[PDB]
Amino acid sequence: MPVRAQRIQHVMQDTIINFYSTSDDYGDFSNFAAWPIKVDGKTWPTSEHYFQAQKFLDEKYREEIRRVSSPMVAARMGRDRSKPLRKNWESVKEQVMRKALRAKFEQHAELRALLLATAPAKLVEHTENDAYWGDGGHGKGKNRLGYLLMELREQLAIEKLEHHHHHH
């Protein structure tokens, strides 16, 4: 498990990367990776914390999910869909998660460089459990999480393509 930029030093081409193992270096691609993210002025343990903090419009409950350092606890008490959810929650998942992913890979140059390293490959989350944001084990999980990572990577590439500085 090497924490490096370019885990695979320039991937092949059209390489379908099916990853499931949050215990090693390929686990960072899984959003459930416990990498501290700095979002909107606060430090969130994982993306799910910010994700479900926007999920619920419960004032004091957001504070709870913001305070809980443990990632699995956020999933546990955030699991419930009986609580008042945002009317646009079904749509704004892409918005909230996109910014969370942004903060994750951007706040860590290691991860950002790792992200562009997986180009031009295709990232596929393979959770043999809950096929959501990841195409699952059966191939129908809405893997657009990995796609958000692809499109985010391209945005980071555009910013990088703005390279114009008197040093290199």
Swiss-Prot record:
Which EC number(s) are documented for this chain? 3.2.2.-
Q: Name the reported effect of E48A.
A: Loss of enzymatic activity
Q: What class of enzyme is it?
A: hydrolase
Superkingdom, taxonomy of origin: Bacteria
Altering W133A: what's the impact? Loss of enzymatic activity
Stored CDD domains: NADAR
Q: Which reaction does it catalyse?
A: 2,5-diamino-6-hydroxy-4-(5-phosphoribosylamino)-pyrimidine + H2O = 2,5,6-triamino-4-hydroxypyrimidine + D-ribose 5-phosphate; 5-amino-6-(5-phospho-D-ribosylamino)uracil + H2O = 5,6-diaminouracil + D-ribose 5-phosphate
Q: Which Pfam families match?
A: NADAR
Keyword annotations for this protein?
Glycosidase, Hydrolase
Question: What is seen without this gene?
Answer: Strongly represses cell swarming but no effect on cell swimming. Cells lacking this gene show significantly reduced FAD and FMN levels (both by 13%).
GO molecular function terms attached to this record: hydrolase activity, hydrolyzing N-glycosyl compounds
Biological process (GO) annotations?
bacterial-type flagellum-dependent swarming motility; carbohydrate derivative metabolic process; nucleobase-containing small molecule catabolic process; riboflavin biosynthetic process
Q: What is the effect of changing W89A?
A: Large decrease in enzymatic activity
Record's function text: Catalyzes the hydrolysis of the N-glycosidic bond in the first two intermediates of riboflavin biosynthesis, which are highly reactive metabolites, yielding relatively innocuous products. Thus, can divert a surplus of harmful intermediates into relatively harmless products and pre-empt the damage these intermediates would otherwise do. Helps maintain flavin levels. May act on other substrates in vivo. Has no activity against GTP, nucleoside monophosphates or ADP-ribose. Is Required for swarming motility.
Similarity comment: family membership: Belongs to the YbiA family.
Q: What protein does this entry describe?
A: N-glycosidase YbiA
| Gene, per the UniProt record | ybiA
